[PDB]
């Protein structure tokens, strides 16, 4: 279930930077953010 | 019995207050044997409290780097891992002010494995920021446009130092 | 930023305390210290005001029954 | 008078001792503590924090030396820790009066666990509420042990018991290894006690004891102040 | 929160608590009295209040203070009978220590042994854990004065200034604020502070026939009860 | 519920209920008074006449524990008798051990501790009698003490136990008992008894009086018949 | 006093009694051990439970205890009670040697301990013992012997036995594959390895996850051995190779 | 935000019991020998009502 989450969230990161495609570092930042939010409860 | 240690620390403090740099080096070259008479913690604290202020005071083109060299060597001797980690980080940051090219990359590259395998994550932020700055200052814009972001990544997660986010920004 | 709040009052003494108050209690803290200053006809708020106000708002006795530890 | 003469801990329909489990749940809420050893000695660290400034912290201790070379610390209930310490002292004297030789640590642990378990099958009582950590240095090789209200005992290289003890276990796993020094051990133990420490760390809120192949000692506030310095 | 017999005997609750001990602590407040103890630079002082609702009662036989030993004094809070029983136990234990070892008992060991005796009650399922709290003051050589407190659950400890009774919390607050001054202490200062603390907590402005005081000093370790005359002297001198 | 069954379990509010039930058991006895004079004390008991078949002097409620100490009781007769026996045995044991008549301040304490031992364990029940002790000594003055089921020993100028404790102690306090000697006290006691237990509650009763003091060489005994005759004749006038 | 009693001794309307039943349900979980005997030498296999990365790994034994020069036993259930029972029987055997100057037969020792155990469920009002343990030995009256105990008190002589959580499958598969008096200390071991394989859900049979003890008869030694961890993995790979050949053949 | 201050009203102190009793004793046709201090002395734990 978290893989769908990381795919959903990786788009918002490109949205913030006003881009048109999704780079790999966006994926990894989304990965770390999901790990971190899961680390709490 | 212990009064001479406090006197040494007072002399170092006064040398920093008045604005002298050579006398710190002279005391450090005159006091290295004396360490082998006190507890390890007291000696390590004296070494750290001397090197911190010594390097902080200013920059000397000839005196400064050998002090860090000898300190890393003595820590390698006494076998304290974290002390050597901190001193090595201080040295790798010290290189850039002297405008070096290669070694500032190699030392940090070596340090990354051990640092990322241990407990702390703040030093990850420090070495990543240093690597980013040295990449940018050596006219290689492609290389550095990624490290900084991952360092901010580790930082925003769990962090406590105020001076870190400002420099990152 | 709205109160004159003297010049020597220290705030770090209060942020570092632990008590997980809400966000609508900070407002009541500042409001109460201000009223405490108004009572005695002094128009500049001093540190003792903050002290008594903080104690007034929080009210947690001990709840720390000790021999379990 | 007369007691009750029937035990209060009995098997549940799923075959689980309810009382010993509830005792463990109570134990988990005590003051945290950690213990480490590496090739030259053993270190025990624990946290203490008085509620107000009126308490005289110089009157009571957590780390209690049984003999010149055996150390004990606890996590959990307050009072009965003293009873167990007294029994351990007595057992030590009883053994020394036969063989004229200091007790090896394993035998001491066996006897103490024997008492603790025997206490759950007697009449009209409830078990203790403590978890013990025992350290010693006999025949060169250092030894560490951890008991349990159920009576089972283990040998650990480095462990942590108390609040949030699972995170302490994970952290020690991610840091502990097989070859180190006593000083690094002390530093890493203090660091792991600071994982969820109080608002501030001082020299009187931390109790640390060491035992090397030269003996067991409790460190005075001066060296605690020095070690807390040049750290964190 | 509970099931079975957690509410009737001293056995563990599912959440890890046990209630038959937690009830004694609130049983303490049934009498409705309060006592305060202070440790000075070279003195130790204890102040308590007494209430005599009717004239028929002989006012000379309601003292809560008792003399354990020629160098050690105790003050009582809580119920009455349990208090007397614990007092007798302490006297007997000290006398036995003197018979066995041939020199005086230090205050700390005595408090430890009485608290340990209390601890057994909360271990079995036949007795009641004695709801009455104890305060001891004494002088130890090479250590000056010392003040200790013992509770029904078995947790003893040495303090610097303590209060036991209905109003424990505010009194501890006041004492903490006062001791934060970090200054020297003398006999007059100790007695004045101890008096005014209780005076302001209860807000009475009393008369010399309602308060009892015990002291000990490092010039004459014999515990003594202050005479009403010098109590009046202290009280009137306090009010500038 | 179920917290009031045994005497080993605290209520949530922090008190024992069995002892309270016992005290309520006491509050249905008849009535007894005891007051101290300049140089002695005087007891007074009113005994209801249940039926004409019994004799006078039956079921004495006044017991002379020793050759110089008197006892009055209220509660259940059997428990009172057992306590009287244990007190008497304690007095004789003390005389044999040391060799002189026991002072009150010690005998009352011994009985109180023995009674208090019956309120902890669940294998026994608390007693059901409250009593009074009196005595006089030439070198010690006049002593009066009162003891309740809980185990509390107090000293009184004069007290009363039974149904109408409050009503009686209203008129106990009016008398100036600090000076006037207890030769005219007896008339006051007869008057103060005849002004209670109206005829509506019961028709007839009888009266007992005791005596102690140096007026009788310190011994404790019963009053002569003519003296109580005169006292009753006098108290017959107070109904006006 | 009666309001707080639990009655750990009464019967039930249906005939049985519940304390030992609950004890059996608890003894069902928590551990796995089995024993096999077919020729000179008998084997015990125990599945280790405490296998975390932070254990000192000392004392040479964790579920195997010597009781005499030729007596060894494993155990399953609550460990502390196991310590109690082992200590209790140790001086039983010592006192037998004191009385007769002769090594004790196995069956007498087992019966004495079983009497001690049953006394608790006969009277006294205490909780019973939650321990099920094995026995292996050699004696002059009947040679090599194996035995199983029960918290109730009953015992019996057996050739192949399991007590672990999945003992049912162990019994079923030992029933179908056994040979009477031929399995020496070379063929029974592979069968034991594969049996333990089927019992434990984790495959690959981690070398550190199992322990094997063997008993052999010698003229003046009566050798009791615990083979080390440098020789288990070879057994594992030998079984893997033979199973691979059988797999590829079919 | 909603209810800012909470004000506690307790059982009267002895001085307060004197103060309160003086009032409702006002209009009664009494005689000038009354000592309120004893009535205070007994009234432990009474409410004003």
Swiss-Prot record, chain C:
Residue list for modification N6-acetyllysine: 48, 52
Source organism superkingdom: Eukaryota
Signal peptide residue numbers: none
Subcellular location: Cytoplasm; Nucleus
Main function: Component of the 26S proteasome, a multiprotein complex involved in the ATP-dependent degradation of ubiquitinated proteins. This complex plays a key role in the maintenance of protein homeostasis by removing misfolded or damaged proteins, which could impair cellular functions, and by removing proteins whose functions are no longer required. Therefore, the proteasome participates in numerous cellular processes, including cell cycle progression, apoptosis, or DNA damage repair.
Subunit description: Component of the 19S proteasome regulatory particle complex. The 26S proteasome consists of a 20S core particle (CP) and two 19S regulatory subunits (RP). The regulatory particle is made of a lid composed of 9 subunits, a base containing 6 ATPases including PSMC4 and few additional components. Interacts with NR1I3. Interacts with PAAF1. Interacts with TRIM5. Interacts with ZFAND1.
Family statement: Belongs to the AAA ATPase family.
Protein name (database record): 26S proteasome regulatory subunit 6B
Gene name, Swiss-Prot/TrEMBL: PSMC4
Swiss-Prot record, chain D:
Record-listed Phosphotyrosine modification sites: 4, 22, 74, 119
N6-acetyllysine found at: 68, 169
Subcellular localization, as worded in the UniProt entry: Cytoplasm; Nucleus
Record PTM text: Phosphorylated on tyrosine residues; which may be important for nuclear import.
PROSITE patterns on file: PROTEASOME_ALPHA_1, PROTEASOME_ALPHA_2
Residues with the Phosphoserine modification: 5, 12, 14
Induction, per UniProt: Down-regulated by antioxidants BO-653 and probucol. Down-regulated in response to enterovirus 71 (EV71) infection (at protein level).
InterPro entries: Ntn_hydrolases_N, Proteasome_alpha, Proteasome_alpha-type, Proteasome_asu_N, Proteasome_sua/b
Top-level taxonomic group: Eukaryota
Family: Belongs to the peptidase T1A family.
Record note on quaternary structure: The 26S proteasome consists of a 20S proteasome core and two 19S regulatory subunits. The 20S proteasome core is a barrel-shaped complex made of 28 subunits that are arranged in four stacked rings. The two outer rings are each formed by seven alpha subunits, and the two inner rings are formed by seven beta subunits. The proteolytic activity is exerted by three beta-subunits PSMB5, PSMB6 and PSMB7.
UniProt name for this protein: Proteasome subunit alpha type-2
Swiss-Prot record, chain E:
Cellular component, GO, one term: cytoplasm
Any single Pfam family the record assigns to this protein: Proteasome_A_N
Superkingdom as given in the UniProt entry: Eukaryota
Chain positions found as N6-acetyllysine: 98, 100
Protein keywords: Acetylation, Cytoplasm, Glycoprotein, Nucleus, Phosphoprotein, Proteasome
Residue numbers carrying Phosphoserine: 13, 59-60
SMART domains named among the record's database cross-references: Proteasome_A_N
CDD domains: proteasome_alpha_type_6
GO molecular function terms attached to this record: endopeptidase activity; NF-kappaB binding; purine ribonucleoside triphosphate binding; RNA binding
Modified residues (Phosphotyrosine): 155
Residues with attached carbohydrate: 1
Compartments where found: Cytoplasm; Nucleus
GO biological process: positive regulation of canonical NF-kappaB signal transduction; proteasome-mediated ubiquitin-dependent protein catabolic process; proteolysis involved in protein catabolic process; regulation of inflammatory response
Gene3D superfamilies recorded: Glutamine Phosphoribosylpyrophosphate, subunit 1, domain 1 (3.60.20.10)
Family annotation (InterPro entries): Ntn_hydrolases_N, Proteasome_alpha, Proteasome_alpha-type, Proteasome_asu_N, Proteasome_sua/b, Proteasome_subunit_alpha6
Subunit details: The 26S proteasome consists of a 20S proteasome core and two 19S regulatory subunits. The 20S proteasome core is a barrel-shaped complex made of 28 subunits that are arranged in four stacked rings. The two outer rings are each formed by seven alpha subunits, and the two inner rings are formed by seven beta subunits. The proteolytic activity is exerted by three beta-subunits PSMB5, PSMB6 and PSMB7. Interacts with ALKBH4.
Similarity section: Belongs to the peptidase T1A family.
PANTHER family per record: PROTEASOME SUBUNIT ALPHA/BETA
Name this protein carries in UniProt: Proteasome subunit alpha type-6
Gene symbol of the encoding locus: PSMA6
Swiss-Prot record, chain G:
Record's note on what induces expression: Down-regulated by antioxidants BO-653 and probucol.
Keywords in alphabetical order: Acetylation, Cytoplasm, Host-virus interaction, Nucleus, Phosphoprotein, Proteasome
Protein encoded by which gene: PSMA4
Keyword Acetylation in record: yes
GO terms for cellular component: cytoplasm; cytosol; extracellular exosome; intracellular membrane-bounded organelle; nucleoplasm; nucleus; P-body; proteasome complex
Family: Belongs to the peptidase T1A family.
Subunit text: The 26S proteasome consists of a 20S proteasome core and two 19S regulatory subunits. The 20S proteasome core is a barrel-shaped complex made of 28 subunits that are arranged in four stacked rings. The two outer rings are each formed by seven alpha subunits, and the two inner rings are formed by seven beta subunits. The proteolytic activity is exerted by three beta-subunits PSMB5, PSMB6 and PSMB7.
Protein location: Cytoplasm; Nucleus
SMART domains linked: Proteasome_A_N
Lineage, highest ranks first: Eukaryota, Metazoa, Chordata, Craniata, Vertebrata
Task performed by this protein: Component of the 20S core proteasome complex involved in the proteolytic degradation of most intracellular proteins. This complex plays numerous essential roles within the cell by associating with different regulatory particles. Associated with two 19S regulatory particles, forms the 26S proteasome and thus participates in the ATP-dependent degradation of ubiquitinated proteins.
Name of this protein: Proteasome subunit alpha type-4
The species this protein was found in: Homo sapiens (Human)
